[PDB]
Amino acid sequence: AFVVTDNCIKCKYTDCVEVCPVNCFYEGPNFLVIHPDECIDCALCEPECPAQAIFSEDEVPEDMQEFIQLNAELAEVWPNITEKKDPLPDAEDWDGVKGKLQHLER
Ligand code: SF4
Ligand code: F3S
């Protein structure tokens, strides 16, 4: 499974959903997650993220390990997203800010 980590929060570019063959991204107010059962690990999404927020599960930084289980739980509750949309309004002021997990919205 590929995992969306911290820098997606409040950026949510959605470029990643274009390339997903199996449409396993699920959508929150300010973040996207990958559903781990559905991802086939084709890795096509991770060059597409402008925030470079997607990682193969086995490559998630030590300080972002929380996101692996977060993606699994929120994918069970959030709606499927299959079409790119606009980036959040202020997405490039927040691109690159560390510590955005405290802004995540359910
Ligand atoms: S690794 Fe492939 S299947 Fe998994 S989320 Fe990315 S594009 Fe979709
Ligand atoms: S910012 Fe998030 S919405 Fe996709 S393109 Fe990157 S994982």
UniProtKB/Swiss-Prot annotation:
**Which cysteine residues pair off into disulfide bonds?**
none
Q: What does this protein do?
A: Ferredoxins are iron-sulfur proteins that transfer electrons in a wide variety of metabolic reactions. This ferredoxin could play a role in regulating gene expression by interacting directly with DNA.
InterPro entries given in the database record: 4Fe4S_Fe-S-bd (IPR017896), 4Fe4S_Fe_S_CS (IPR017900), 7Fe_ferredoxin (IPR000813), Fd_C (IPR022569), FdxA (IPR054829), RnfB_subfamily (IPR050294)
List the biased-composition ranges (Basic and acidic residues). 95-106
User: What is the name of the protein in this document?
Assistant: Ferredoxin-1
Region Disordered, as annotated, extends over 83-106
Q: Which GO terms describe its molecular function?
A: 3 iron, 4 sulfur cluster binding; 4 iron, 4 sulfur cluster binding; DNA binding; electron transfer activity; metal ion binding
Residues that, per the record, bind [3Fe-4S] cluster: 8, 16, 49
Keywords per UniProt: 3Fe-4S, 4Fe-4S, DNA-binding, Electron transport, Iron, Iron-sulfur, Metal-binding, Repeat, Transport
| Keyword 4Fe-4S in record | yes
Q: Please name the Pfam families in this protein's record.
A: DUF3470 (PF11953), Fer4 (PF00037)
Q: How is the cofactor bound?
A: Binds 1 [4Fe-4S] cluster. Binds 1 [3Fe-4S] cluster.
Residues in domain 4Fe-4S ferredoxin-type? Answer: 1-29, 30-59
